C-alpha cells in the first residue's frame, strides 16, 4: 500500500505533496550552494579555488533554485494541490501522466549531481553558453549530464503543462466560464502555456549543443559556419519566458493571499488581473534579446528590445496597484502569510524597477554582466518568487496537513528572512553600479565592504531557513488539528476540510446558469 500510494500515485494531492517535499529538499541544496558562493566572496582572496569550482557552484545554485525548488513547489506542488480543488474537479485530466512529471525530477536532479561529481563539473553559468560549454573548453561528461538533466526537467514540465492546460480548460463545472475561475488557476494556466511554447525551443538549443559536443555538428562553432550567438538567441527565447513562469504562479498566490487576509470576498479588478497576466505572458515572448545588449546587435534592434521590454511595466503595474486596492478598505488580518505577501508587493516592485533600468540598452552596456543584474533578479526571485512561496506555504499548510503552525514563530521567521535577504542583496546594487562583474570568485579590493555585508546577510537568511524547518517540525509535533477557517464561501479549496479526503468532488459541485 505504501508503494502503491507514493510511487504509483494517480492522486493530485499526493503528487502535490511529493512535489512539495522534493522542492523543499532542493531548496536546502540551493541554500547550501548560495552560502558557498557567499563564503567565497565574504572576504577578499580565494577560499575554495579558482573560478572553475566557484562557477560550478554558481551554476548548480541557479539550476537547483529554478528547476528543482521554485517550479516544482509552485507548479507541481501548489498547482497540483490547489487547481483541481479550486475548480471542483475530481483530479487532473491525466492523473497517471502527472505522476511521471513528478518522477522525472529525481532523475533530473541525479544527473545534475553527477555533472558536479565527474571531471571538474560544469562551470558554465546556468546559461551554458558555448564555446565555454563546448567539448574543448569543457571536455568530458559534465556539460552533457547538465544537458540531459535539463532535457528530463523539460519533459517533466512540458507534460505537466499539457496536463494543467487540459484540466483547466476541460474539467470546470459546466456553468463555470473561464471568467469565473480563481486567479491562481488563471496564473497556472498561463504559466503552463508559456512552458509549452518555450521549453521545446530550449530543448532544440541544448540538443544542438549536445551534437556540437558529441556528433561533430557546428551549429555554434564558427569553424563550420556556426555562431555562438545563435545559441544565446535560442536559450533566451526560452529564458525570458522562464522568468515569467517563475513569477506568475507567485502572482496568483499573492492575489489569493492578499484577498483572504484583507477579509475580501474577491480581488480588486479581476478582469484587469487576468488581462495583466495574459499581457505579461505574451510580451514575455518578444523581449529575449535584452539578455544580449552587449553581443553586437544592430542599433535598431537594441531600440526595439529596449521599448518592448519596458512596456511590460504597464500590465505589471496594474497588478501591483490592484493588490493595493484589494488591501484598501479591508479588515486586515496581520497573519504571517499576509506579511510575506506585503513584503512581496514592495520588494517585487523594487526588483521590477531595476529590471526597467536594465531594459535601457544604453545603460545596460555598463550594467550588463555586473552585480546590478544579480541585484535585480534576486529581488524578484529571492524576495518575490520565494516570498510568494513562503506566504502560500504558511497559508495553505493547514489545508494540506490538517495542522496549524505557530503563528508567532512564523512571524519571527518572516522577520529574520526579511532582514537577511535585504542585507544580502541591497548592497549588490552598489557593487554593480561601481563595476563588479558577475561570476567572479574574487574582486578588486575596493569592492570589499559591500561583499562583506552581503555575505553577512546570506548567513542571516540561513538562520531563517533553519528556523523554518523547526517550525514545520513543531507543527507536526504538536498536532493542533484544524476545525474551521473563515471565508470558505470564496475559497473553495478549504470546503472539504483539512486535509481533504483522498477523493474529493466525487459528487461534483452544483452550479447553475440562470
Amino acid at each position: 500500500m505504501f508503494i502503491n500510494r507514493w510511487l504509483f500515485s494517480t492522486n493530485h494531492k499526493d503528487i502535490g505533496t511529493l512535489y512539495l517535499l522534493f522542492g523543499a529538499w532542493a531548496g536546502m541544496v540551493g541554500t547550501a550552494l548560495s552560502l558557498l558562493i557567499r563564503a567565497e566572496l565574504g572576504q577578499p582572496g580565494t577560499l575554495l579555488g579558482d573560478d572553475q569550482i566557484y562557477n560550478v557552484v554558481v551554476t548548480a545554485h541557479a539550476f537547483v533554485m529554478i528547476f528543482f525548488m521554485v517550479m516544482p513547489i509552485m507548479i507541481g506542488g501548489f498547482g497540483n494541490w490547489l487547481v483541481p480543488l479550486m475548480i471542483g474537479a475530481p483530479d487532473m485530466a491525466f492523473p497517471r501522466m502527472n505522476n511521471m512529471s513528478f518522477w522525472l525530477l529525481p532523475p533530473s536532479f541525479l544527473l545534475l549531481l553527477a555533472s558536479s561529481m565527474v571531471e571538474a563539473g560544469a562551470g558554465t553559468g546556468w546559461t551554458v553558453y558555448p564555446p565555454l560549454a563546448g567539448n574543448l573548453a569543457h571536455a568530458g561528461a559534465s556539460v552533457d549530464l547538465t544537458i540531459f538533466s535539463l532535457h528530463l526537467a523539460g519533459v517533466s514540465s512540458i507534460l505537466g503543462a499539457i496536463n494543467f492546460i487540459t484540466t483547466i480548460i476541460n474539467m470546470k463545472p459546466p456553468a463555470m466560464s473561464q471568467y469565473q475561475t480563481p486567479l491562481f488557476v488563471w496564473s497556472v494556466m498561463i504559466t503552463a502555456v508559456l512552458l509549452l511554447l518555450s521549453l521545446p525551443v530550449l530543448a532544440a538549443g541544448i540538443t544542438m549543443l549536445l551534437t556540437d559536443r558529441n556528433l561533430n555538428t557546428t551549429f555554434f562553432d564558427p569553424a563550420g559556419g556556426g555562431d555562438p550567438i545563435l545559441y544565446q538567441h535560442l536559450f533566451w527565447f526560452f529564458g525570458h519566458p522562464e522568468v515569467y513562469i517563475l513569477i506568475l504562479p507567485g502572482f496568483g498566490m499573492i492575489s489569493h493571499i492578499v484577498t483572504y487576509y484583507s477579509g475580501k470576498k474577491e480581488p480588486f479588478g479581476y478582469m484587469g488581473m487576468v488581462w495583466a497576466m495574459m499581457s505579461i505572458g505574451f510580451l514575455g515572448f518578444i523581449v529575449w534579446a535584452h539578455h544580449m545588449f552587449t553581443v553586437g546587435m544592430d542599433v535598431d534592434t537594441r531600440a526595439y528590445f529596449t521599448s518592448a521590454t519596458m512596456i511590460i511595466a504597464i500590465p505589471t503595474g496594474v497588478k501591483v496597484f490592484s493588490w493595493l486596492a484589494t488591501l484598501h478598505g479591508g479588515n486586515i488580518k496581520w497573519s504571517p502569510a499576509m506579511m510575506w505577501a506585503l513584503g512581496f508587493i514592495f520588494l517585487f516592485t523594487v526588483g521590477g524597477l531595476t529590471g526597467i533600468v536594465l531594459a535601457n540598452s544604453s545603460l545596460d552596456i555598463v550594467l550588463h554582466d555586473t552585480y546590478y543584474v544579480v541585484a535585480h533578479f534576486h529581488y524578484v526571485l529571492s524576495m518575490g518568487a520565494v516570498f510568494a512561496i513562503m506566504g502560500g506555504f504558511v497559508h495553505w499548510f493547514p489545508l494540506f496537513s490538517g495542522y496549524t503552525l505557530n503563528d508567532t514563530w512564523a512571524k519571527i521567521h518572516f522577520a529574520i528572512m526579511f532582514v537577511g535577504v535585504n542585507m544580502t542583496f541591497f548592497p549588490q546594487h552598489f557593487l554593480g553600479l561601481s563595476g563588479m562583474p558577475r561570476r567572479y570568485s574574487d574582486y578588486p579590493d575596493a569592492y570589499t565592504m559591500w561583499n562583506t555585508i552581503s555575505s553577512m546577510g546570506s548567513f542571516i537568511s540561513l538562520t531563517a531557513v533553519m528556523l523554518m524547518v523547526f517550525i514545520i517540525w513543531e507543527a507536526f509535533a504538536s498536532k493542533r488539528e484544524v476545525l474551521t477557517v473563515d471565508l470558505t464561501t470564496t475559497n473553495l479549496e478549504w470546503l472539504n476540510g483539512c486535509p481533504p479526503p483522498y477523493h474529493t468532488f466525487e459528487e461534483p459541485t452544483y452550479v447553475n446558469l440562470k
Partner: protein, 43 residues
C-alpha cells in the same frame, strides 16, 4: 483559523531540543567540511 488544542503539546523544553537538533543538523556537517578546507586543498 480555529483548531483543537494540541494532541501532543510541545513544551518550551521540547522546542529547545527540536530547535537545537535542527540547527545542529545543518551546521555540524558543513562546519566539518569548511573547518577542513585547508586539509583538502593539499590532498
Amino acid at each position: 483559523i480555529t483548531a483543537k488544542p494540541a494532541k501532543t503539546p510541545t513544551s518550551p523544553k521540547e522546542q529547545a531540543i527540536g530547535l537545537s537538533v535542527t540547527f545542529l543538523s545543518f551546521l555540524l556537517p558543513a562546519g566539518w567540511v569548511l573547518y577542513h578546507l585547508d586539509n583538502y586543498k593539499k590532498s
